[PDB]
Amino acid sequence: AKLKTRRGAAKRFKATANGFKRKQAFKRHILTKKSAKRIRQLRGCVMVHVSDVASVRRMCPYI
Amino acid sequence: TLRLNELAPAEGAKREHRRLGRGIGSGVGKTGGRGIKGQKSRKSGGVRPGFEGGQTAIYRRLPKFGFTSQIALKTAEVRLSELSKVEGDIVSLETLKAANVVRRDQIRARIVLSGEITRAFTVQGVALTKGAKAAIEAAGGKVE
Amino acid sequence: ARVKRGVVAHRRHKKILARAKGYYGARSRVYRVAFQAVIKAGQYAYRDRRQKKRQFRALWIARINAGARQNGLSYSRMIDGLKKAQVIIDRRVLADIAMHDAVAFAALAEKAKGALA
Amino acid sequence: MNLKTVSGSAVELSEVAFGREFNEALVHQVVTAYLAGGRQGTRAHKSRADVSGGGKKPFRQKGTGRARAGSIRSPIWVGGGKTFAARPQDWSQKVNRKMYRGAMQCILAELVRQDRLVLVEEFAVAAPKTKELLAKLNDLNAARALIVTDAVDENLYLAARNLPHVDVVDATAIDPVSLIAFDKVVMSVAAAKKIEVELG
RNA sequence: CUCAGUAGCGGCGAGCGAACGGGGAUCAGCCCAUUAAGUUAUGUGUGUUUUAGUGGAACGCUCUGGGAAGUGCGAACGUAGAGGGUGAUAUUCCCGUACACGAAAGGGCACACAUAAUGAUGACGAGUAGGGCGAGGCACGUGAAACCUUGUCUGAAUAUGGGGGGACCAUCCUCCAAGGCUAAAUACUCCUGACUGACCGAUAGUGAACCAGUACCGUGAGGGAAAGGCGAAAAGAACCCCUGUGAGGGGAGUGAAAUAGAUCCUGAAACCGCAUGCAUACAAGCAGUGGGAGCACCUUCGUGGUGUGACUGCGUACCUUUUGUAUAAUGGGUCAGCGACUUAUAUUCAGUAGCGAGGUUAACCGUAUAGGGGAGCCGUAGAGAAAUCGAGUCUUAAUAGGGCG
RNA sequence: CCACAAGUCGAGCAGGUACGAAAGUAGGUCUUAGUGAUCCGGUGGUUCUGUAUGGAAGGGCCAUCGCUCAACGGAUAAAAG
Incomplete structure (x- = not known):
């Protein structure tokens, strides 16, 4: 049978030229107590760590 | 020479497959490379990919983001150097589909500056970047 | 391609049993x-070995040692004397001469004690 | 190249079809693919599920002093199922079009430079007679041979049917194993031209 | 076959999973009361096929041998050198094979006519479409949930009309429900004929090669075995002797062979006897190993070979599981036979071969491993959630800075 | 600093401010505890998308709200002998 994508991982990751990009955690709620620096530095996308790239490749084989 | 018993494959083309559990001298006897006991030594022993022993996984402790656009599935991208496969001088969506650089179900295309062209082309109804238009005009074509 | 094991297995067992010739009881009859x-x-x-x-x-x-003590020396003193006299005959030949030729061993002991003196 | 028929007539053949260098690995791959594609692959065995009977546990799990067992058709038991039962298989491989054509070109060039290909202007038989065909091959000194012609005349086919080590094929039916197995290949000029157009 | 494991669904978990479009196989439409295409029976005609069969080529000598088809020397047929048998291995010994002929009588199929009958209670579709409540189906779990079915309660308009285009409204596009019939391309094998196998060869292959769903077990449903081989030909041992007119054997005879003599080809191992050579009844233990006298036979007379081994140094089996086992921790009475990393699909990496900024076809067609088939797939460009731009793009008031390229 | 997910310090640049005559100081409090991922929903904004088309519903992005999930990397919305 064809390999099946893990759709949760597909919804959480996207592919770049040499890796995968992802969003950052701790920005959904409980935001008042956090300082402005954390608020603005937890915004945007970062890269998937090389320790997790292999697992991401196993879970999402077509992206 | 040239007989059914005088033909050979190239060196390194074929290898013997590995056979487990066939004695001490083979080096993979007894356990067959699986180690001693535990879940991974059993039949069908590996755990599901993405399982990390119980803690919240990498794809579940991170948030979802984005939405999928439907028009992106029908937008097609064409390299400038692929215009060489076009037969004739007119470059259009139908002609690119006939030349097999665009899938038949796409409804529009864009030309990017990637390679080089030599012939003079006429473009009708295909989007061009600023570099690609300059390249086309330098080669000797016109737009629309 | 179905393979039967009888001929090769019999050959291996027969070779082991042939190498086990002469042993007591089941050690020369029973394959295990x-x-x-x-x-x-x-x-x-x-x-x-x-x-x-x-x-x-x-x-x-x-x-x-027996020959040296017959000639009035101990083994250690005789060896030291021969080393000082520079004779490099080894113990195998020395023991052969001690067994089969008393006169030659007496000459060797004389040389050793002369060097010791 | 110029080639010379048995009568000394000169024929022109391009380097593409009859002049390539010999690539032994390519030829071996194509020949092995043909031999594997010739297989039938019809067989089967019975696993522990397919063998008759065996549904009930032979005896209770504990207390009897025997080794525990679940069925009398276990692959450990005599009369039980086979551990890994076979099924019918397909043994055909894929061969690239260009790889196949290149292998045929190499085979033809090797035959030419080994002097096993004999070019003849015309090869026809008057009547379906094995003796007549045998004499015609003997005069050419091609007793063991594969005969390639532009078209397969019924008289020639009937004459060749009973001859050992002699077979006749059309120009569009040559195969690499046949080109190699026979001692010589006797080819007509028209067939050579068609194989030239096909480039092996 | 692709699109595509994409769009989506989902304690947004595990998992489930389309369609549009494109490429093929096959192609076909006809009617609602005077009523069609089509289908089914019956008879006739024509064609084919089938149920027995007939003819069917060509070899001698010599050597070995129980026996020739085998050695050596020469010859013949071939639209027949497929296969089987004959005392060992046959195109020319037999049955056959290629090929050419053949049917009183019966059967199948095809096409065409005649008669039936069906299609065909049905004439443009009302308790219907739609709606409220509860469920089910759709890739779609109540969700923004369209569309289909209906258990319960209701309920239109009827061509200036009505359904759909994924909540809903308007505009456009498209179709006409509440009446019917219809071949092919598709699915399967209790069975029949022919042919085939890098399928098995008596613990294998069907449970069953043999008087097998039998013996046997069970109240019953049900479960379920073991067991093939004399010899080319019985020529299967007349007759004599021991013995109980027994069993069994010894002669004679047959046979190439009887240690091929009846549960009879070959006849391994565990296990059990007889015979010869050496050692062994004052000496303590995984039984061997390194030395080593004597004896017996052979002998090229030896610094040789074979068998045995007085005396002597060292020396607590194997497997598994463990920090660690002689362990008094596990497993094995012994032998022989069987017994465990496979197969299909998808994907990634490494070798190797072809082509190379290109590479490659899938289904399918094809008297078919060829040749056609370019739909599709991978590579050739990124950035962004996206619209959009594009060797750049995103963020920003910023051309600053910074992130991915 | 660190397996990951996270955490900590920061000169300097642009805009708008406050206090000083000025050079200047200020991106919370001497510092190290006062905390909770993802999913699902709510509220404000938006030059994003919008299943024929124009809207809309729904979704996205930015900001923010609802945990003694305290067995505090949190198996279910929901569980004793």
């Missing part, structure tokens, strides 16, 4: 017991 016996024999042979050299050197030293 015979197979265990052959490996142990190989291990013993490997160890005894080293033990043999020590045993024969001990025998030579004992015979040289």
Whole structure:
């Protein structure tokens, strides 16, 4: 049978030229107590760590 | 020479497959490379990919983001150097589909500056970047 | 392609049993017991190829000691005297001469004690 | 190249079809693919599920002093199922079009430079007679041979049917194993031209 | 076959999973009361096929041998050198094979006519479409949930009309429900004929090669075995002797062979006897190993070979599981036979071969491993959630800075 | 600093401010505890998308709200002998 994508991982990751990009955690709620620096530095996308790239490749084989 | 018993494959083309559990001298006897006991030594022993022993996984402790656009599935991208496969001088969506650089179900295309062209082309109804238009005009074509 | 094992298996077992010739009881009749016996024999042979050299050197030293004490020296003093006199005849030949030629051994002892003096 | 028929007539053949260098690995791959594609692959065995009976546990799990068992058709037991039962298989491989054509070109060039290909202007038989065909091959000194012609005349086919080590094929039916197995290949000029157009 | 494991669904978990479009196989439409295409029976005609069969080529000598088809020397047929048998291995010994002929009588199929009958209670579709409540189906779990079915309660308009285009409204596009019939391309094998196998060869292959769903077990449903081989030909041992007119054997005879003599080809191992050579009744233990006298036979007379081994140094089996086992921790009475990393699909990496900024076809067609088939897939460009731009793009008031390229 | 997910310090640049005559100081409090991922929903904004088309519903992005999930990397919305 064809390999099946893990759709949760597909919804959480996207592919770049040499890796995968992802969003950052701790920005959904409980935001008042956090300082402005954390608020603005937890915004945007970062890269998937090389320790997790292999697992991401196993879970999402077509992206 | 040239007989059914005088033909050979190239060196390194074929290898013997590995056979487990066939004695001490083979080096993979007894356990067959699986180690001693535990879940991974059993039949069908590996755990599901993405399982990390119980803690919240990498794809579940991170948030979802984005939405999928439907028009992106029908937008097609064409390299400038692929215009060489076009037969004739007119470059259009139908002609690119006939030349097999665009899938038949796409409804529009864009030309990017990637390679080089030599012939003079006429473009009708295909989007061009600023570099690609300059390249086309330098080669000797016109737009629309 | 179905493969039968009889001929090759019989050949292997027969070779082991042939190497087990002469042993007592089931050790020369029963394949399992015979197979265990052959490996142990190989291990013993490997160890005894080293033990043999020590045993024969001990025998030579004992015979040289007897000859030296017949000629009025001890083994250690005779060896030291020969080393000082620069004779490089080894213990195997020395023991052979001690066994089979008393006069020559007496001459060697005279040389050794002359060098010791 | 120029080639010379048995009568000394000169024929022109391009380097593409009859002049390539010999690539032994390519030829071996194509020949092995043909031999594997010739297989039938019809067989089967019975696993522990397919063998008759065996549904009930032979005896209770504990207390009897025997080794525990679940069925009398276990692959450990005599009469039980086979551990990994076979099924019918397909043994055909894929061969690239260009790789196949290149292998045929190499085979033809090797035959030419080994002097096993004999070019003849015309090869026809008057009547379906094995003796007549045998004499015609003997005069050419091609007793063991594969005969390639532009078209397969019924008289020639009937004459060749009973001859050992002699077979006749059309120009568009040559195969690499046949080109190699026979001692010589006797080819007509028209067939050579068609194989030239096909480039092996 | 692709699109595509994409769009989506989902304690947004595990998992489930389309369609549009494109490429093929096959192609076909006809009617609602005077009523069609089509289908089914019956008879006739024509064609084919089938149920027995007939003819069917060509070899001698010599050597070995129980026996020739085998050695050596020469010859013949071939639209027949497929296969089987004959005392060992046959195109020319037999049955056959290629090929050419053949049917009183019966059967199948095809096409065409005649008669039936069906299609065909049905004439443009009302308790219907739609709606409220509860469920089910759709890739779609109540969700923004369209569309289909209906258990319960209701309920239109009827061509200036009505359904759909994924909540809903308007505009456009498209179709006409509440009446019917219809071949091919598709699915399967209790069975029949022919042919085939890098399928098995008596613990294998069907449970069953043999008087097998039998013996046997069970109240019953049900469960379920073991067991093939004399010899080319019985020529299967007349007759004599021991013995109980027994069993069994010894002669004679047959046979190439009887240690091929009846549960009879070959006849391994565990296990059990008889015979010869050496050692062994004052000596303590995984039974061997390194030395080593004597004896017996052979002998090229030896610094040789075979068998045995007085005396002596060292030396607590194997497997598994463990920090660690002689362990008094596990497993094995012994032998022989069987017994465990496979197969299909998808994907990634490494070798190797072809082509190379290109590479490659899938289904399918094809008297078919060829040749056609370019739909599709991978590579050739990124950035961004996206619209959008594009060797750049995103963020920003910023051309600053910074992130991915 | 660190397996990951996270955490900590920061000169300097642009805009708008406050206090000083000025050079200047200020991106919370001497510092190290006062905390909770993802999913699902709510509220404000938006030059994003919008299943024929124009809207809309729904979704996205930015900001923010609802945990003694305290067995505090949190198996279910929901569980004793």
